[PDB]
Each structure stands twice: as C-alpha cells, then as structure tokens.
C-alpha cells in the first residue's frame, strides 16, 4: 500500500528491488511489536496503518 | 470513384447482350474523368500500322485501369479499383490462371471496336523478352538457321497455350519504336562494355575492396576473349547518353504487378483477386 503496485501491474526490476528493500526493512523493524514498544501513540498509528 | 461512359451512337439489343457478357473486364482510360465519351474507351484510339507493341506497352503505363461494374442500355458503370480491397475480374486472355498468380496487363497482338490481355507475370515477361530477341534477329533473316531460331521463337509452351506470336519485322522493315528499343539495348551493352574499363580505374583510386579486384579480373577476361585519356565533354556525353537511353527501358525491365489472385471460378472464366496497383 506504500507504493501503488496492485494486481493489474507488471514489474520492472527496479520496482521489485524497492519492494524487496521495504520487505526486509519492515520484517526486521516491526516483527515483534508489543514486546518492544509500549507507547500508545505508535500502537495507534500501527493499528490505523 | 465512379466513371460514366456513354454512346452518342445507337446500340443494338444483340450488342447489349454482347456487352453485358463483358460484365467485369478491364478497360484502359486516358484520364480519370467523371464523364467520358466512348472514343476514349479501350485501345482503338491508338491502333495503326506503325506503333506495334513497344508504343502500346509504353503508353499503357501512364494510363489508368478501370473495371466495368454494370451495363445500362445507354451508359456503362466503370468502377476504378482501389488498393487493398479485392475485386472480381474476367479472364479475357487466352491464358488460364492458377491460384497465387501475379497478374499483368498487356495489349493484345494476336467504325470503332472495343479491345486487353490479362496475362500472369512470368508468361508476360518471357514473351516480352522473346519479342525483344525476335526484334534483335530481325535485320538478318536471309539465313536459314536464324530462321529456324525465329520459328522456334514463335511458339511458347504453357498449359493450354499454343500461341503464334506475330512477326515484329514486316516487309523487311522493323517498326521504329522496337528499333529504338533494341538500339537502346545494344548501346547500353556497348557503352557499359567500354566504360567500365576506364571507370574501374577512375573509382579504385579510393578505398578498394576485393569486389573491384574481381571486377577488373572479369573485365580482363572479357577484353582478352574479345580482342582512356578522354576529353571531358565527350566523356560527359557518353555517361549522360548511357543513362538517358537506359531511362527509356524502365517499361521493359520491370513488371508492374497489378492483381494478386485468389480462388478461381470453375472453367476459369472469372477469378476473385486483390488489386495491388
């Protein structure tokens, strides 16, 4: 949802490289959420995300 | 487009029945004009004693071609074909067509009349060059083996085609346009044969490839199996005369593809074809 790459599209290699960069960054950063961050603002931003 | 031709004369009903039998054939036209008389119709405005064949083939290039659509009792609907869409023609030529034949248009050789042959391209090409070499032989016909070559040169072999092409020379006299055509061929041959020896030197002072080497080898084979400091204006006259008498041979060296044919009616009296012209 960060970049509009919906189900009717083709993919250049640069697009897939950006998709993989976001995959690795968000599987690393927000894997275990509630065991790390106990502040209500970030959890609210995550839930509306 | 649409072409209307009429008749100021009077038309018999038997001739009406004769005319509607020519329902879809080709008629040449000197200018694409919407109304036209029937004295411009067909080839009867160009027949004489002296023109013969090369004038007719050179004249049918700059004329346009139509197809008859329908026949009324006093005006004939002539429909000019367009490129791409397919049409229906009738075989008025003695040749019978097959599928895939590229069709060519040719004047027929063998107080007003309507007369053109629609021959496929290879037969048209071979009778063109046959009439050409039969005009090349036409000055020395007193001998017998060249007369046997002429008699072999008359008849062509094709599927249901035993044709007797007429003699181009008549009363030991060739017609003047065939005379200019064969003269143009003889002079382009001679001018080539003596100017390539000078110009292969006058060109190979630049970057020379091996094609120039094999060219000069072929020329020395020619010059030894047969047998330079020229004035500029005579050289210019040589080259320009070469190219301008070459220029009046474009009608004979090419073949204007006119029709590409499709599936054929039985008895080969009509055929569906595309007008590629």
């Amino acid at each position: 949802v960060e970049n509009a790459t919906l189900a009717r599209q083709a993919l250049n290699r640069i697009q897939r490289s950006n998709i993989l960069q976001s995959f690795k960054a968000k599987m690393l950063a927000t894997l275990f959420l509630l065991n790390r961050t106990r502040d209500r603002d970030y959890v609210l931003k995550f839930l509306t995300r | 487009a649409n072409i209307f031709c009429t008749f100021d004369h009077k038309l018999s009903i038997a001739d009406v029945g004769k005319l509607t039998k020519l329902v879809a054939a080709v008629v040449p036209i000197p200018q694409r004009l919407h109304l036209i008389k029937h004295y411009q119709l067909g080839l009867h405005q160009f027949v004489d004693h002296t023109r013969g064949y090369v004038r007719l083939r050179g004249l049918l290039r700059n004329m346009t071609l139509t197809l008859m659509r329908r026949v009324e009792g006093n005006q004939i609907l002539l429909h000019v074909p367009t490129h791409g869409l397919l049409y229906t023609v009738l075989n008025t030529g003695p040749v019978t067509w097959e599928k895939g034949d590229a069709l060519c248009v040719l004047p027929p050789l063998f107080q007003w009349e309507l007369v053109p042959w629609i021959v496929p391209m290879p037969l048209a090409l071979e009778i063109n060059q046959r009439l050409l070499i039969m005009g090349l032989f036409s000055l020395d016909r007193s001998y017998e083996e060249v007369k046997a070559a002429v008699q072999q040169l008359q008849t062509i072999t094709f599927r249901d085609a035993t044709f007797t092409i007429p003699d181009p020379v008549i009363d030991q006299h060739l017609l003047i346009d065939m005379k200019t055509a064969c003269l143009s061929m003889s002079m382009v041959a001679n001018l080539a044969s003596e100017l390539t020896m000078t110009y292969v030197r006058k060109l190979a002072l630049e970057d020379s490839s091996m094609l120039l080497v094999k060219c000069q080898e072929l020329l020395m084979r020619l010059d030894r199996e047969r047998s330079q400091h020229v004035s500029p204006d005579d050289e210019i006259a040589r080259l320009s005369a070469l190219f301008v008498m070459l220029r009046q041979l474009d009608d004979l060296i090419r073949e204007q593809v006119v029709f590409t044919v499709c599936d054929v009616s039985p008895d080969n009296k009509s055929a569906t074809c595309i007008f590629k012209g």
Binding site: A4, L6, R8, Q21, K45 | -
Partner: protein, 327 residues
Amino acid sequence: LAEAATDSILDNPTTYTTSSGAKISGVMVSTANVMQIIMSLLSSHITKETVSAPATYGNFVLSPENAVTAISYHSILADFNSYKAHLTSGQPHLPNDSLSQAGAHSLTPLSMDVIRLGEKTVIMENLRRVYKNTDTKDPLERNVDLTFFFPVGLYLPEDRGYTTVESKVKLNDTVRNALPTTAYLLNRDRAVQKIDFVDALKTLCHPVLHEPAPCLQTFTERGPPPMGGAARRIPHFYRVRREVPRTVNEMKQDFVVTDFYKVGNITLYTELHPFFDFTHCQENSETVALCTPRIVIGNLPDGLAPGPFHELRTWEIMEHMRLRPPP
C-alpha cells in the same frame, strides 16, 4: 508558508465562507501519508467545520458584438457593453471585471476539515480518493534527484597531520592502515559497502582517458597568454655568457603543496592532464603547443604529488612484499 503567499485578485467574499464569517484564506493538499502525520501531530488545530461552496459552474455568456469583433479582428474584449458605456460616459473605473459577475447565487454546504494558523484558515485536503485503484500515479509523488559526491584515495599532509579521535579508535601501526586507498559508503539499508580502485576498472582503462587530441585542439585555440660534433662542442656552448630561460616544467616545482592551487601561481594554465605535460615551447620563432606525455608518475609536479607522498607509497610497496622490516 501560509503568510508568504500573496492574496489573489478576484474579490470573492461570499464564496467559500465558513460559519461566523471566518473566511477561507487558502488550501493545502498532499498525499494521505503526510496528512496522517500532520493531523496526528497537530491535534489542537483541526475541526470538522462545513463551508458553503458554490454548487454550479460559472456560466459566462458571450456578447454578440464580441462575436462580431472576434470574426473581424481575431480578438475578444470581455464585457464589451460595460466598456462601451463607461468609456463614453466618463468614469474610468469599472465596478467589476468579467469573471466576478459569474459563479455565484448557489450555495451548498460540505464537510471538509480546516486548519487555523494565526487568523489564516486553510482547507486541508488529502487526495487519495481520486487515485486509489487508478493506473496513473499521483503528481504529488514528485521525483527529486540529488547529486552526491565523495573523494577516494586522498592524501592529507604530514606536517599538519593530527588525530581528533584518540580515545575512540586505535589502529595497528601497519602502513596499509596509515595511507588511504579505499572508501566505505552506505547502501539503502545500513550496510557498509566498499569502493576501492579495483572496482573503477570499467572506467580507468578506457582509451578516451589516454587520448589528448581534443585537449591539445582546445589548448592551441587559446594559444599563449647534430650529436656527432656535440662531444667537442660541449665547451663551445659555454663560451657565450648568456643564461638560459627557466622552462615551464621546472617552474612547477618551486611551489609548496598548499599554495599550488592559488592564483599567485602562473603555470596552472599548462596543467591540463595527469598523463601528459602540455606546454608552450619555441619552434620557428613561434609559440607552439607541444603536447608531450609523462611516462612515469615521478614526472608529476611537487604540489600535485609531494616527496613524502612517494615515500609513503614506497612504504606501502615494501609492505606488500612482506619486507616492512628491511634487512
């Protein structure tokens, strides 16, 4: 940002009015991802108030004499009737233009959120709902490139050398760690990559890097601003008591490494390529551009490669062959 934009020209006091007469001063648009930052960051300046927007388009009709002068002189003068009346009447100031008397007399409320920035009231507007499930990308996702640049393999001087980081790092005293030849960078992810000289080989051995023909061609356009008898004629050279003028390459060596780039230098206009020695010389009593190559790297000038730099280079070479203690 809001107080830097000037106001408009068309006086339109009625349209886009909120309740209690608080007029709308502007409009802010962006993507939804910035609005989710701003509206969550600014929770004390956001209300869901309704504004009385116009309901119909501003239908503007053409006068007939406008059409006549349009056919005749290829131009339109808008509201020709008011111009014609006020010209021959005498007053030189019109009530309104042609566009303020069009686009009114229809009011319909709609609930779009506003913001308040010091008497200025700006309509905030996310534009996601026009572009979701749509083949075209947003114009508001503008692409901007930046030009980064960095040096590799440099040489800081030794007479001004120092360490502002002593407690943090400590390197072993090998020559390979006291003279730079590599450079480390950052990727998209925080991973330390490495550039060195070997990776630049798809550039460094091209023939255009060694071809000075357009260099010489543009240098000459600027222009200037018998061994047999020699062994006996060596003292014949010195009978004449004249001096020889100092050549240009020798004049490149009396400059220190820190002022060779200054404007006080003269011979910088002959320093054009690291692989050659472009110079002016005398031939047929005419200054000619003598394009000559350097063969070894020792022919580089002092200000461009000092002596101690070559000492450190040969120290690295002695390190590379396992000879850093010399016999």
